[PDB]
């Protein structure tokens, strides 16, 4: 594309950050895209097969716009939204979950967790805003799982369990990001 | 009240999540009452106090926080996916907690308390500051409780019944624990 | 829509253009129904579908757009006051199209349909993305028509009815065309 | 005005960007000025002779607050306006115009095309907000005439006319930025 | 008015002060009537004029000021916290006067006046400028005086019925005055 | 306490802008501190001896969130806020005074004059939004007193009373920032 680039040039989708047999995730950031740098946008390309599950996680600062290209997706964000709560109260917990069809969009705000179920073999394109320094935290699977960095002292005080008992729950998971959510 | 007598003067901090060794207050939205301090909308102040030998169970905030030691001495652990980083706050000590990083703040041993000043820089929503806890306690249950059992079975590789066991809880005490030993 | 606060699930757009050749669709402002999306306030999302062998008449955007191919491959020519720049995009390609740059998209020689995801980045009018097309349409005349006869004729250096032949047509096909032969 | 003297001191009008005998235009972009840069604002000094037509066109990104400093001016400004005409065909084309005089202001939005006539010996001064990286695109004249730059078949496919016959009209404009606008 | 259909065409200011020495006039919110000019919220155009041999008494300003000389000549003295920086400002000139900087405009002797454009870049109450005059007048008394006895007292380590007599006055030729000249 | 500590690794308080028999004033600024830049905030400590009073002044651009930690503070904050009361005389003067006790928060707006009397053994913390390039300039005192650099024939016209006159009412304070807040 271009005998005459030096402006925008074309960006495609090169090596994966998360790859394996369940799915793939292709993120391009601003730290590595002058074009996306100027603009503050990050892109991705989520790959998946039916029965594969995209473990619970949340972005630190990026608000991701999920676009459904080819496929059906069960979603699930989870929340804690308002402020005219104030004195604790009102501030309730939500589970917002759905089925994305082709052309169905879903927004995944900054500190919310989420998990994506792939009812079919599935393709999604996301656009995260405020992508600078984005970090993505995992609360399940072996790797990137933050609930597992926490040490036993605290762990058993945080959770109704015991450092190892919990510790087992945490090791239970053989894999990483992507999994099989076999029915049940 | 309702709408600022002009007032730049402010004593009222709402009750977030107190106890027998704790406290947690969040000062109101600067621009709730007054039209005048408009440039201060996207920020919030949380004053939080605690006795000796107590913890503040891990949780993340969806905001960028700047922390401050008003009285006491502390210990800040900050958990990220590859290790934990541990700090000490002591008088005036200040540190900036990056939005979205799970973290637990403690106050070691003695007999003097702990008084921290939390200053929120908001992004996902002006004024809004939501701290997300891993624990099911009297009031709020844990966020890992908002997914389908199917998600939790699939994710975890444990049975809803194994999960729910180290999921939810009585958390009798709640969010400001006591440093067991 | 009309009203649904609390929602993230966006699944309903707006057609700006439709013809048996292609489609141009804009989506609901992310904060249409809800206050919960204040942040995504400056961003609009468009969609462009074109049948095989079609041309998307020159025009410029009042705002920056992020453009990214979902299905097909294409030809994009960016008019500069210097010359033109032409790029060929395949699945996943993406480029940025700053505001003020006139540009056209072609779908080549093939049976292949075109799918383009156009992320618009508003600045001049918030949440608002405007379009400025040079050609005449039974849908909107060409902005070159708003000028006086004098202002027109002077710039140009050609008498009025000589100009009225660039000026206004009956450009059959509106904005999406059937690229030639 | 001072021996010891180096701040960000004051600037003025140094080297025109467009001069021909119908007018002059001076610019001071954020790119070359320090104080202007932390404002992200540009300034303009329009010097136009009675009879001039500062040709139609538009700015890529700066929003120009035009002030009338000396003389009268008749401006024409075009705009698709309020998307808040979520219609097209229900989205209209309005032309606004004014014969502005001293202390009178016209505001020239980002992609709106504007053209200005010079009813008397004229002086204007502008200020551009969002001033950075702004490019001025001419819709007429010889130099920087964006229309000249659409190749044949397209241009052909775009105007009721035909590629050359349209190419024809294009290079009919003797001149460049400011032109003699003596009636017909 | 305030309800004004589509225009980016302005003519109407507000007298802020007129005396046969000069006036100040402050333009209206570019957005008080239109909705299009929405990105212009924090700027205001101020038109300042003065008759030869004149003084616009030292005052500080809320916002950032970009000043240009559209007609005239003047002397910019810029009162720093430990100096002055005077500047001769021929016409055509401009200079960014930072906020919370006390400044004073001399109009030097002669024949021709002064006309200055005052574009403001407001931060505090976006779109609301404010001026802090130090010299008492039939409009607004010195800011220095909304203080208190016991405050003005050591603040100056003087006695009230004299500070007063060195702060509170009358300035008919108030804001814009006439030197010894 | 943490050797291999670093990055957003703590920060405390080294050297005071003001120091006398009456008080201390420490400042940490974006200019000087890694994680203060991007936050765009100034951090400050107010240590004051019972009776002293912070000299009347204003900051150029940082809004300061005055939080009372210990002791009683006596505050006078001069103001006149909203641009809808124009034609000059409209938005007028309003004194905002009050006594801060432990925990009360008072907010000091970008341009407004303020003075602090120490009602009892004080310590005050100040957070400040918009700090870059911000300065204090004292209306009183003897140091960085601006009105002290306003010339004789400037003053004399500016103020009731003589140039020498004004010129002296400013000589009377043999001190700079914190004085003696004894009454009258």
Give the 3-state DSSP-derived string for chain A, with helices as H, strands as E and coil as C: CCCCCCCCCCECCCCCCEECCCEEECCECCCCCHHHHHHCEEEEEEEECCCEEEEEEEECCCEEEEEECCCCEECCEEEECCCCCCCCCCCCEEEECCEECCCCEEEECCCCCEEEECCCCEEEEEEEECCCCCCEEECCCCCCEHHHCCCHHHHHHHCCCCHHHHHHHHHCCCCCCEEECCCC
Cβ-based contacts of C29 with chain E (< 8 Å)? none
Structure tokens at A123: 């393709």
Strand partners, A116: A54
For A135, B8, F79, F178, the CA distances from F95, given in Å and listed in that order, are 48, 11, 7, 21
Please, are residues D130 and E39 in contact by the beta-carbon 8 Å criterion? yes
DSSP code at position D170: H
Residues 6+ apart with CB under 8 A from E95: D9, D10, D11, D35, E66, E67, E76, E87, E89
Check CB contact of D125 with chain C, cutoff 8 Å.
no
Among candidates C83, C139, C166 on the partner chain, residue whose Cβ is nearest the Cβ of D161: C166
| Cα–Cα distance, C58 to C60 (Å, whole number) | 7
Distance CA A128, CA F160 (A): 62
Alpha carbon distance D141, D114 (integer Å): 14
Alpha carbons C129 and E163: distance in angstroms, whole number? 60
Q: How many CB pairs under 8 A join D and E?
A: 92
Q: Are E19 and E79 in contact (CB under 8 A)?
A: no
- Is B66's CB within 8 Å of F104's CB? no
Residues of E in contact with F86 (CB under 8 A): 14, 16, 26
Which of B6, B31, B38 is the best residue to mutate to test the E interface, defined by the most E CB atoms within 10 Å of its own CB? Answer: B38
CA–CA separation, E157 and A20 (whole Å): 78
Give all chains having 3 or more CB-to-CB distances under 8 Å with chain A: B, C
Collect all residues of chain D within an 8 Å Cβ-Cβ radius of residue C179.
157
Intra-chain end-to-end CA distance of chain F, in Å: 51
Q: Which residues pair with C13 in a beta bridge?
A: C27
Q: Quick check: E117 and D67 in contact, CB under 8 A?
A: yes
Asked if residues B103 and B58 have their Cβ atoms less than 8 Å apart, the reply is yes
DSSP chain F: --TT--SS--B----EEEESSSEEEEEE-TTT-GGGTTTTEEEEEEEE-TT-EEEEEEESS-EEEEEEEEEEEEEEEEE---TTS-SSSSS--EEEEEEE-TT-EEEE-TT--EEEEEEEEEEEEEEEES-TT--EEESSSSSSBGGGSS-HHHHHHHSSS-HHHHHHHTTS---SSB------
Question: Among D135, D146, D121, which Cα is nearest to D24's?
Answer: D121
Q: Which domains does chain E possess?
A: 1-181 (2.60.120.10)
Distance of alpha carbon E119 from alpha carbon D157, whole angstroms: 46
Those of residues 101-160 in E touching chain D at CB distance below 8 A are 117, 119, 121
Residue A130 gets the label, from left (phi > 0), alpha (psi -120 to 50) or beta, of left
Any CB–CB contact under 8 A between B161 and chain A?
no
Cα–Cα distance, F72 to F100 (Å, whole number) = 5
Q: In angstroms, what separates the C-alpha of F36 from chain E's closest C-alpha? A: 19
CA separation for the pair D22, D173 (Å, rounded): 14
Q: Please state how this structure was obtained.
A: X-ray
Q: Name residue, tokens 């919110």.
A: E29
* Distance between CA atoms of residues F182 and F184, nearest Å: 7
Q: For chain F, positions 71-90, list CB contacts with chain B under 8 A.
A: 77, 79, 81-82
Secondary structure string (H, E, C) spanning E76-128 = EEEEECCEEEEEEEECCCEEEECCCCCEEEEECCCCCCEEEEEEEECCCECCE
The burial of F12, by beta-carbon neighbours within 10 Å (0-12 exposed, 13-18 middle, 19 or more buried), is given as middle
- In 3D space, the residue among B33, E125, B122, B41 whose CA is nearest the CA of residue F109 turns out to be E125
For residue D39, give how far its alpha carbon lies from the nearest alpha carbon of chain E (Å): 8
C-beta separation of A105 from A67 below 8 A = yes
The nearest alpha carbon in chain B to F1 belongs to: B88
Distances (CA, A) of F30 to A149, B2, F107: 32, 35, 20
Numbered residues of chain C with Cβ closer than 8 Å to any chain B Cβ: 36, 38-39
Q: Bridge partners of E176?
A: E56
- Cα–Cα dist B42/F63, whole Å: 14
SS3 E40: helix
Report the C-alpha gap between C90 and C86 in whole angstroms: 14
A101: exposed, middle or buried (Cβ count in 10 Å: 0-12, 13-18, 19+): exposed
Phi and psi torsions of A153, nearest 5° = -55, -60
Contact assessment for residue B8 and residue B40, using Cβ atoms and an 8 Å cutoff: no
Contact A115 B82 (CB under 8 A): no
Nearest by Cα to D102 from D121, D115, D116, D76:
D121
Residues F47, C74: Cα–Cα separation, whole Å: 67
E75 in F contact zone (CB under 8 Å): no
- Distance CA(C95)–CA(C118), nearest Å, equals 10
What is the C-alpha separation between C61 and C98, in angstroms, rounded? 8
Contact of C68 with C115, CB cutoff 8 Å: no
Identify the domain containing residue F48 by its residue range.
1-184
Report how far residue F146's alpha carbon sits from residue E79's, in angstroms, rounded to the nearest whole number. Answer: 7
Q: Which chains touch C (3 or more CB pairs under 8 A)?
A: A, B, D, E
**Looking at the 3D structure of chain D, how many domains does it have?**
1
CB < 8 Å to A7, chain C? 78, 85
DSSP string, E59-78: EEESSEEEEEEEE-EEEEEE
Two structure tokens written together for F23: 């008080």
Kindly list the residues from chain D whose CB atom is less than 8 angstroms away from the CB atom of residue C55.
Answer: 154, 157
Q: Characterise B75 by phi-psi region: left (phi > 0), alpha (psi -120 to 50), beta (else).
A: beta
Tokens read off for B71: 């009285």
- Output the 3-class SS for chain B: CCCCCCCCEECCEEECCCCCCCCCEEECCCCCCCCCCHHHCCEEEEEEEECCCEEEEEEEECCEEEEEEEECECEEEEEECCEEEEECCECCCEEEECCCCCEEEEECCCCCCEEEEEEEECCCCCCCCCEEECCCCCCCCCHHHCCCHHHHHHHHCCCHHHHHHHCCCCCCCCCECCCCC
Please state, in angstroms and rounded to a whole number, the distance separating the CA atoms of residues A158 and B171: 9
CA E69 to CA E119: how far, in whole Å? 12
CA distances to A52, A55, A77 from A179, in Å: 5, 7, 18
Cα E19 from chain centre = 14
Interface C-E, measured as beta-carbon pairs within 8 A, has a size of 7
Neighbors of chain D with 3 or more C-beta pairs under 8 Å? C, E
D75-112 residues labelled b (16+ CB within 10 A) or e (exposed): bbbbbbbbbeeeebeebeeeebbbebeebbbbbbbbbb
Give the containing element (helix H, strand E) for C17.
Answer: strand C13-19
Say yes or no: F95 contacts chain B, CB-CB below 8 A: no
Of the candidates B125, B122, B145, B121, the residue with the CA atom closest to the CA atom of residue B134? B145
Euclidean distance between CA atoms B63 and B78, whole angstroms = 15
Helix (H) or strand (E) holding C154: helix C149-156
Q: Quick check: A29 and A61 in contact, CB under 8 A? A: no
Longest dimension (CA), chain C: 58
Nearest-Cα distance to chain B for C31, in Å, is: 12
Q: What CATH number does residue A162 fall under? A: 2.60.120.10
D83/C125 Cβ within 8 A: yes
C-beta neighbour count of B38 within 10 angstroms: 16
- Between CA C133 and CA D184 the distance in angstroms is 28
Say which DSSP state C140 is in: B
Rounded Cα distance, A81 and B124, in Å: 10
Would you put residue F54 in left (φ > 0), alpha (ψ -120 to 50) or beta?
beta
Cβ–Cβ contacts within 10 Å for residue C2, how many?
5
Q: Say yes or no: B167 contacts chain A, CB-CB below 8 A.
A: yes
Alpha-carbon gap: B98 to the closest alpha carbon of chain A (Å): 8
Bridging pattern class, strands A23-25 and A18-19? antiparallel
| C19, C174 Cβ separation under 8 angstroms | yes
* E55 three-state secondary structure: strand
d(CA D88, CA C99): 20
Torsion angle of alpha carbons B155, B159, B161, B163, nearest 10°? -30
Q: Which of D6, D105, D123, D130 would you mutate first to test chain E, the one with the most E CBs within 10 A?
A: D105
- Residues A60, B98: C-beta atoms closer than 8 Å: yes
| Contact: chain A with chain F (3+ CB pairs below 8 Å) | no
Contact in structure between E75 and E30 (CB atoms under 8 Å) = no
Instruction: Quote the CA–CA distance of D129 and D64 in Å, as a whole number.
Output: 7
For residue B144 the two structure tokens come to 């890992």
Q: Are E57 and E133 in contact (CB under 8 A)?
A: yes
Beta carbons within 10 angstroms of residue E1's beta carbon: 7
Q: Which residues of E touch C123 (CB under 8 A)?
A: 39
Using alpha carbons, select from B160, B143, B142 the residue that is nearest to residue B151.
B160
- E34: which DSSP letter? -
- Burial pattern F74-95, b for ≥16 Cβ within 10 A else e, equals bbbbbbbbbbeebebeebeeee
User: How far apart are the C-alpha atoms of E88 and F68, rounded to whole Å?
Assistant: 46
Q: What is the H or E stretch that residue E162 is in? A: helix E160-163
Q: How far is CA D97 from CA D77, D79, D114, F106, in A?
A: 6, 11, 10, 50
Tokens of E8: 């980016």
Chain A to chain B, count of Cβ pairs less than 8 Å apart? 179
User: What is the rounded CA–CA span in Å between residue F178 and residue F52?
Assistant: 6
Q: What element of type H or E holds C10?
A: strand C9-10
Q: Which residues in chain B have their CB less than 8 angstroms from residue A182's CB?
A: 154
Task: Compute the distance between CA of residue C92 and CA of residue E72 in angstroms, rounded to an integer.
Answer: 59
Closest-approach residue (CA) in chain A for B141: A93
Q: Contact at 8 Å (CB) between E56 and E50?
A: yes
H-type helices in chain D, by residue range?
Answer: 34-37, 152-158, 163-170
Chain B: nearest CA to C39, how far in angstroms? 6
> In angstroms, what is the C-alpha Rg of chain C?
18
Rounded to whole angstroms, the Cα distance separating C119 from C133 reads: 19
The residues, any chain, with a CB within 8 Å of residue D27's CB and separated by 6 or more, are D17, D42, D43, D44
**What does the alpha-carbon distance between residue D73 and residue D66 come to, in Å, rounded to a whole number?**
11
């Amino acid at each position: 594309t271009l005998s005459s680039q030096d402006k925008p040039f074309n960006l495609r989708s090169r090596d994966p950050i998360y790859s394996n047999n369940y799915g793939k995730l292709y993120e391009i950031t601003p730290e590595k895209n002058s074009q996306l740098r100027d603009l503050d946008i990050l892109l991705n390309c989520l790959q998946m097969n039916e029965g594969a599950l995209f473990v619970p996680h949340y972005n630190s600062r990026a608000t991701v716009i999920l676009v459904a290209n080819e496929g059906r997706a069960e979603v699930e964000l989870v929340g804690l939204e308002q402020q005219q709560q104030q004195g604790l109260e009102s501030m309730q917990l939500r589970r917002y979950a759905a089925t994305l069809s082709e052309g169905d969009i879903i927004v995944i705000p900054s500190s919310f967790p989420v998990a994506l179920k792939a009812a079919s073999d599935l393709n999604m394109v996301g656009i995260g805003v405020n992508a600078e320094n984005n970090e993505r935290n995992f609360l399940a699977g072996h790797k990137e799982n933050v609930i597992r960095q926490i040490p036993r002292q605290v762990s058993d005080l945080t959770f109704p369990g015991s450092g190892e008992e919990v510790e087992e729950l945490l090791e239970n998971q053989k894999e990483s990001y992507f999994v099989d959510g076999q029915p049940r | 009240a309702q709408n600022n007598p002009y007032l730049f003067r402010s004593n009222k901090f709402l009750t977030l999540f107190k106890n027998q060794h704790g406290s947690l207050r969040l000062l109101q939205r600067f621009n709730e009452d007054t039209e005048k301090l408009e440039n201060l909308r996207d920020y919030r102040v949380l004053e939080y106090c605690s006795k000796p030998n107590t913890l503040l169970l891990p949780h993340h905030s969806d905001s960028d926080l700047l922390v401050l030691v008003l009285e006491g001495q502390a210990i800040l652990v900050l958990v990220n996916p590859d290790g934990r980083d541990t700090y000490k706050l002591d008088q005036g000590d200040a540190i900036k907690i990056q939005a979205g990083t799970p973290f637990y703040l403690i106050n070691p041993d003695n007999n003097q308390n702990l008084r921290i000043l939390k200053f929120a820089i908001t992004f996902r929503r002006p004024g809004t500051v939501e701290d997300f806890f891993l624990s099911s306690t009297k009031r709020l249950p844990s966020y890992l409780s908002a997914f389908s059992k199917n998600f939790l079975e699939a994710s975890y590789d444990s049975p809803y019944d194994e999960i729910e066991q180290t999921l939810l809880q009585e958390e009798q005490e709640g969010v400001i624990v006591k440093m067991p030993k």
